[PDB]
């Protein structure tokens, strides 16, 4: 009741938190594929 404003703030941060962890996973997956291609062109 007195905390509705901060509860809604936390809610948006919780949604953004899950987007950022998902984005990181997609970026480390990409980085791994780019790392394998870099190795194949290198060695």
């Amino acid at each position: 009741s007195d905390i509705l404003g901060m509860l809604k703030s936390l809610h948006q941060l919780q949604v953004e938190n899950r987007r950022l962890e998902e984005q990181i996973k997609n970026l480390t997956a990409k980085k791994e594929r780019l790392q394998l291609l870099n190795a194949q062109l290198s060695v």
Binding site: M6, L7, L13, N17, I24, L27, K31, L34, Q35, N38
Partner: protein, 41 residues
């Protein structure tokens, strides 16, 4: 408790900033690899 609610916001704000800064570093490493791959191709 207002303070408890305030502190959940703060902690998750700090965490999301850590995630955003981890994405920046991931983006920079991806740029390093895509430049190196373009050069070696």
């Amino acid at each position: 408790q207002i303070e408890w609610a305030k502190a959940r916001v703060e902690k998750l704000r700090k965490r999301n900033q850590a995630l955003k800064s981890q994405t920046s570093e991931l983006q920079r490493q991806i740029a390093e690899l895509e430049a190196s791959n373009a050069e070696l191709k």
